[PDB]
Amino acid sequence: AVVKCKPTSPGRRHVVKVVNPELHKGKPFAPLLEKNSKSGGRNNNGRITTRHIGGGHKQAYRIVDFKRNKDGIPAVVERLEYDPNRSANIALVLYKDGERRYILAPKGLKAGDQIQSGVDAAIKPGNTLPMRNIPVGSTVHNVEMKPGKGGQLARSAGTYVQIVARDGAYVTLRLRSGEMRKVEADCRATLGEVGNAEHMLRVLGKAGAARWRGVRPTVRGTAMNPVDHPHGGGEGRNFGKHPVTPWGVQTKGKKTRSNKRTDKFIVRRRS
Amino acid sequence: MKRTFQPSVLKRNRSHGFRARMATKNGRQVLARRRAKGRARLTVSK
Amino acid sequence: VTSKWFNIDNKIVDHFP
RNA sequence: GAGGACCGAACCGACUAAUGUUGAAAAAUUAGCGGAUGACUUGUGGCUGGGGGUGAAAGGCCAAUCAAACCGGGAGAUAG
RNA sequence: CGCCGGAAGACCAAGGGUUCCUGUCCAACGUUAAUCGGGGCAGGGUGAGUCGACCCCUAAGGCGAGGCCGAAAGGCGUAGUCGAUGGGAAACAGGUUAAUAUUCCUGUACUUGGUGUUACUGCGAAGGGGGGACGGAGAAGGCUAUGUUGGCCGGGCGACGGUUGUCCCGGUUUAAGCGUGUAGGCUGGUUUUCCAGGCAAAUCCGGAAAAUCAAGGCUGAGGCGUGAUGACGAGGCACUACGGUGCUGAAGCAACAAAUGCCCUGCUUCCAGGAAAAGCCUCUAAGCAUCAGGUAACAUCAAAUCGUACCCCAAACCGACACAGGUGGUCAGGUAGAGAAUACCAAGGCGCUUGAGAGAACUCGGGUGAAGGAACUAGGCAAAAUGGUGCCGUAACUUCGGGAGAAGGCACGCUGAUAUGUAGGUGAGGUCCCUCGCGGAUGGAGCUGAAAUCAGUCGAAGAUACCAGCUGGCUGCAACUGUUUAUUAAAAACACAGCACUGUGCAAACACGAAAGUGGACGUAUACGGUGUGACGCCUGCCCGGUGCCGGAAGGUUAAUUG
RNA sequence: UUCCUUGUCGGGUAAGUUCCGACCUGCACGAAUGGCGUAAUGAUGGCCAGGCUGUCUCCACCCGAGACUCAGUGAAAUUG
RNA sequence: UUUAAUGUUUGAUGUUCUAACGUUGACCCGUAAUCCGGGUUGCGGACAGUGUCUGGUGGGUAGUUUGACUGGGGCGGUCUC
Ligand SMILES: N[C@@H](Cc1c[nH]c2ccccc12)C(=O)O
Ligand SMILES: [K+]
Ligand SMILES: [K+]
Ligand SMILES: [K+]
Ligand SMILES: [K+]
Ligand SMILES: [K+]
Ligand SMILES: [K+]
Ligand SMILES: [K+]
Ligand SMILES: [K+]
Ligand SMILES: [K+]
Ligand SMILES: [K+]
Ligand SMILES: [K+]
Ligand SMILES: [K+]
Ligand SMILES: [K+]
Ligand SMILES: [K+]
Ligand SMILES: [K+]
Ligand SMILES: [K+]
Ligand SMILES: [K+]
Ligand SMILES: [K+]
Ligand SMILES: [K+]
Ligand SMILES: [K+]
Ligand SMILES: [K+]
Ligand SMILES: [K+]
Ligand SMILES: [K+]
Ligand SMILES: [K+]
Ligand SMILES: [K+]
Ligand SMILES: [K+]
Ligand SMILES: [K+]
Ligand SMILES: [K+]
Ligand SMILES: [K+]
Ligand SMILES: [K+]
Ligand SMILES: [Mg+2]
Ligand SMILES: [Mg+2]
Ligand SMILES: [Mg+2]
Ligand SMILES: [Mg+2]
Ligand SMILES: [Mg+2]
Ligand SMILES: [Mg+2]
Ligand SMILES: [Mg+2]
Ligand SMILES: [Mg+2]
Ligand SMILES: [Mg+2]
Ligand SMILES: [Mg+2]
Ligand SMILES: [Mg+2]
Ligand SMILES: [Mg+2]
Ligand SMILES: [Mg+2]
Ligand SMILES: [Mg+2]
Ligand SMILES: [Mg+2]
Ligand SMILES: [Mg+2]
Ligand SMILES: [Mg+2]
Ligand SMILES: [Mg+2]
Ligand SMILES: [Mg+2]
Ligand SMILES: [Mg+2]
Ligand SMILES: [Mg+2]
Ligand SMILES: [Mg+2]
Ligand SMILES: [Mg+2]
Ligand SMILES: [Mg+2]
Ligand SMILES: [Mg+2]
Ligand SMILES: [Mg+2]
Ligand SMILES: [Mg+2]
Ligand SMILES: [Mg+2]
Ligand SMILES: [Mg+2]
Ligand SMILES: [Mg+2]
Ligand SMILES: [Mg+2]
Ligand SMILES: [Mg+2]
Ligand SMILES: [Mg+2]
Ligand SMILES: [Mg+2]
Ligand SMILES: [Mg+2]
Ligand SMILES: [Mg+2]
Ligand SMILES: [Mg+2]
Ligand SMILES: [Mg+2]
Ligand SMILES: [Mg+2]
Ligand SMILES: [Mg+2]
Ligand SMILES: [Mg+2]
Ligand SMILES: [Mg+2]
Ligand SMILES: [Mg+2]
Ligand SMILES: [Mg+2]
Ligand SMILES: [Mg+2]
Ligand SMILES: [Mg+2]
Ligand SMILES: [Mg+2]
Ligand SMILES: [Mg+2]
Ligand SMILES: [Mg+2]
Ligand SMILES: [Mg+2]
Ligand SMILES: [Mg+2]
Ligand SMILES: [Mg+2]
Ligand SMILES: [Mg+2]
Ligand SMILES: [Mg+2]
Ligand SMILES: [Mg+2]
Ligand SMILES: [Mg+2]
Ligand SMILES: [Mg+2]
Ligand SMILES: [Mg+2]
Ligand SMILES: [Mg+2]
Ligand SMILES: [Mg+2]
Ligand SMILES: [Mg+2]
Ligand SMILES: [Mg+2]
Ligand SMILES: [Mg+2]
Ligand SMILES: [Mg+2]
Ligand SMILES: [Mg+2]
Ligand SMILES: [Mg+2]
Ligand SMILES: [Mg+2]
Ligand SMILES: [Mg+2]
Ligand SMILES: [Mg+2]
Ligand SMILES: [Mg+2]
Ligand SMILES: [Mg+2]
Ligand SMILES: [Mg+2]
Ligand SMILES: [Mg+2]
Ligand SMILES: [Mg+2]
Ligand SMILES: [Mg+2]
Ligand SMILES: [Mg+2]
């Protein structure tokens, strides 16, 4: 649920937090953890290649199962957990043979529920099938783009995809951006939407709350000198030029996609 | 107040030492110039 | 050097514009 | 028993005034001043290199040097 | 006599390198003299199985066989191999030198290997599993370091009134190890049968089923016992080459208070969700199978090499100086106090390497001031004032938290009584139980001890010193805490939570790179980048002609090419 | 943000080019290079009052460190 | 002159295909290896992408220019006949 903090301090007045009482209060499953060191937005040349990144809390990577290729063996959800590396929540599932894995938690999934993957699985949320066995119109998530590669679409909190049509070897999906696309019908997808759909209702409340997430402050280009940004300079506040990125390219309207080899899979761009 | 030279013999050697000069092509150019000139101490070593 | 801070201080130096 | 909560030492800063101005000091002292569980502070190590870095953005900082560092060379540049 | 005493004392890391200690010298060095010195000269001094490095293991990062890429030089990177600021076996007390000591000596210990004998026996990894192994805050409870008082022991009977007592001074210390297993903390235990899991196997780990048991196990400060009939010990005595050296040696207890240390890597809670690898335990594979190998006891051997002096808030390091500067960690007594603030002291250490006079103007740093009280000035700048604890009391406005310590006011010492010291805290002896114990109940000796009320009393003054808010009214700007021109600008500037537009369908856009690649991100449109605005409230009107961007494609013009 | 300009009117003062309230003749405001408000906050700008005072009328005395004399050591800028 | 029928390119367009080429899909081996290479297969596929030439855009970056007279210079005016 979303709760509003009381204004007992200027830094608490506007904070809204999302509290889920049914997450796990404990340490995560140790065998499925890994090391995740930060970068500061710097590449192998030592140079800043993405700006406004740096700092934050230490985090551990949870090895999440995006492929779901353990076909035919049922699993039971053991608990729901907090993942620092993604906006959605993960679930820990135990297979009938004694293997534990992490999956993205769909909406409505709670501890004790039964999930299964493969061509013979039932049509209920949390189940993974190839998309030629999923009825048209269904709402799916964690969609594969190439068979056997692992899910890459609709992986964020509250997102999903719709299977709009099927024709021979391809299905037409409506992506969350409102964009039609064709994928091969042998790609798998999980039934249902991604949980934590109230993740967007939170309000950070203070400037230090965003430094906990590893985001350094942004300086407006219009507040620089001409040697720094194309927007800099002037006495008082002057703009008098068309907006551009710090490397000179026009923003606010110009289109940047140029990929001629995947253009055959785009039925219709977003609007 | 704090000055610019804060000694540390570990970083003095990992920066300017003999084995650091020898590790690159330009470092070995410096050592060849100091031998030609005739310097008694080639590097900051011991 | 060059200073003689009062030969750098430009209230003292730049007195007649 | 929360909090970029409160008062206040260590610690980090630098708002005012006086002294000093071939200084005790190439930026300090004295008396007051701000923050003081945090967007804090500090030790050791590492990475980014000059039209380049880094910059909560002052053309600020990059070894007392910065509207383009320092060293050597072109070089005895050119100088109505 | 004065000064520091959360240091101006003691111990280290970094850095320096002989400055350390003894004899001798005073030319130069020392902001003066020097018989002195961190100065000159000569000699001496640094002792380790356990402390540190080296060593085994890794982080960020480096290098990198092959490899991919690049005019050359080279770039990136796999297997690997390095790289601590982190993980990994083991020693304490006393004595001793002029100068080293957990290193030497005395006493008492512990750790890991090799070899050998004896006894029993399934051993084996580059592989599997466990473990190592981890956040912020908060609250205590149990302790100890440590301190105070009493008892005990040794000495004292006082330069001036008094001082054989409810008097004065000093001491009252003891370790690692080894034994026991306690306050606390976590966890259900045992056996059997089966199994799509753990790159193969597994008796190990994971999972499923049944029977049985109400307990078992893991961890753990402190205390107690021993170590220890020892050592140390106030003093006394005997010498002194006057610095010290030799000998002997009493008491060596209890109560109370108490940590920021320990149990505690615990427990509770929150969201921002909190290293890796080895040592270590265990399971098997290939292999070997009267062996080898493993477990235990005993005996024996080994534990190499390098550091070790001295200074380290400093005259020895960084600042050209014997320079009001800078410099990480550890230790942390008393009386008042909430306190590591502040005042006076202890242990300990110092008086800052020119002095002697005098007592002009002026400058610097302070004290007091008649009457007035901002008239000063750009401006109450600077000074003066306020200042503590407890209780009463407190407006507009408000986002309902605030404002607010609003404003303002009252009490405050000492002595006596309530009460020969109260409420509270701690808790002995004793008695009973049993679980005969590091136990439970009762009990209250002794110790410690606020706050208040009544009564009296002194001063001009009782928050007496040090320490320690000035307050209120109207208004501009920026919501706020932050950041910024090291070294003349701290702000109304930058940031910010929030808002909007816009790009991006994943080999993403985008950025760094002749490239390979890398970041974005081990993310996936509730995500990511760019741009502007800037909490919140009420809102954000008209113009697409110009420049830009987006869509269109009929027609006009239009390159290489062809010829 | 307003040149003319110390606009005019009201308030506060004995006296107010600043301040506060209004008016609108906006040289030359105005709606995310946001408009108008706003509790709390600020070493933020302006103005007013109480207390307090050597800031001042208008200075006087005292306490120390220099300045002065003696002994010792011993500079610098500058200069036909 | 118009027209078609004929065989061909040769162009244009379109649709199929696979064998170049791509693969930051899966699996197997070198191998103790998320690099690389080889192999088997899937999906794309003569497209994409790279070279040479070419039109456009291009303060992202660079080199430069921005007159003289003048009762100081700028502003204004003038500069030859
Ligand atoms: N006058 C001051 C400050 C100062 C230092 N350097 C300066 C240069 C210019 C002006 C002033 C200064 C001094 O001498 O310490
Ligand atoms: K592990
Ligand atoms: K910004
Ligand atoms: K500007
Ligand atoms: K608290
Ligand atoms: K740190
Ligand atoms: K340069
Ligand atoms: K001398
Ligand atoms: K000197
Ligand atoms: K270390
Ligand atoms: K093992
Ligand atoms: K088992
Ligand atoms: K030593
Ligand atoms: K106060
Ligand atoms: K400030
Ligand atoms: K700024
Ligand atoms: K966006
Ligand atoms: K990554
Ligand atoms: K227009
Ligand atoms: K237009
Ligand atoms: K138009
Ligand atoms: K105006
Ligand atoms: K008036
Ligand atoms: K009046
Ligand atoms: K405003
Ligand atoms: K301020
Ligand atoms: K104000
Ligand atoms: K292929
Ligand atoms: K092409
Ligand atoms: K003239
Ligand atoms: K003339
Ligand atoms: Mg950004
Ligand atoms: Mg932003
Ligand atoms: Mg600026
Ligand atoms: Mg520019
Ligand atoms: Mg302007
Ligand atoms: Mg605070
Ligand atoms: Mg302070
Ligand atoms: Mg600063
Ligand atoms: Mg100051
Ligand atoms: Mg100060
Ligand atoms: Mg304050
Ligand atoms: Mg404070
Ligand atoms: Mg923080
Ligand atoms: Mg500027
Ligand atoms: Mg220099
Ligand atoms: Mg500098
Ligand atoms: Mg230049
Ligand atoms: Mg030349
Ligand atoms: Mg020359
Ligand atoms: Mg004192
Ligand atoms: Mg010497
Ligand atoms: Mg000496
Ligand atoms: Mg002398
Ligand atoms: Mg000395
Ligand atoms: Mg000497
Ligand atoms: Mg490399
Ligand atoms: Mg190693
Ligand atoms: Mg010594
Ligand atoms: Mg392991
Ligand atoms: Mg006696
Ligand atoms: Mg006696
Ligand atoms: Mg007498
Ligand atoms: Mg006594
Ligand atoms: Mg290893
Ligand atoms: Mg020195
Ligand atoms: Mg020098
Ligand atoms: Mg001195
Ligand atoms: Mg000093
Ligand atoms: Mg310090
Ligand atoms: Mg003190
Ligand atoms: Mg002493
Ligand atoms: Mg005097
Ligand atoms: Mg007076
Ligand atoms: Mg008087
Ligand atoms: Mg008076
Ligand atoms: Mg006046
Ligand atoms: Mg006047
Ligand atoms: Mg003042
Ligand atoms: Mg009022
Ligand atoms: Mg209230
Ligand atoms: Mg109230
Ligand atoms: Mg009050
Ligand atoms: Mg105003
Ligand atoms: Mg502000
Ligand atoms: Mg502030
Ligand atoms: Mg400054
Ligand atoms: Mg200043
Ligand atoms: Mg300043
Ligand atoms: Mg962005
Ligand atoms: Mg703005
Ligand atoms: Mg167009
Ligand atoms: Mg008036
Ligand atoms: Mg007005
Ligand atoms: Mg404006
Ligand atoms: Mg405008
Ligand atoms: Mg508008
Ligand atoms: Mg606008
Ligand atoms: Mg406004
Ligand atoms: Mg004199
Ligand atoms: Mg003299
Ligand atoms: Mg001269
Ligand atoms: Mg240019
Ligand atoms: Mg151009
Ligand atoms: Mg040129
Ligand atoms: Mg001219
Ligand atoms: Mg003229």
Numbering used by the authors:
A (entry chain BC): 2 to 272
B (entry chain B2): 1 to 46
C (entry chain B5): 8 to 24
The authors write:
Free L-tryptophan (L-Trp) stalls ribosomes engaged in the synthesis of TnaC, a leader peptide controlling the expression of the Escherichia coli tryptophanase operon.
On the other hand, the base of 23S rRNA residue U2585 is pushed away from its normal RF2-bound conformation by Pro24 of TnaC in our structures, and occupies a position that would clash with Gly251 of RF2. Thus, while RF2 can associate with the stalled TnaC–ribosome complex by interacting with the A-site codon, its GGQ loop is unable to fold into a productive conformation and catalyze the hydrolysis of peptidyl-tRNA.
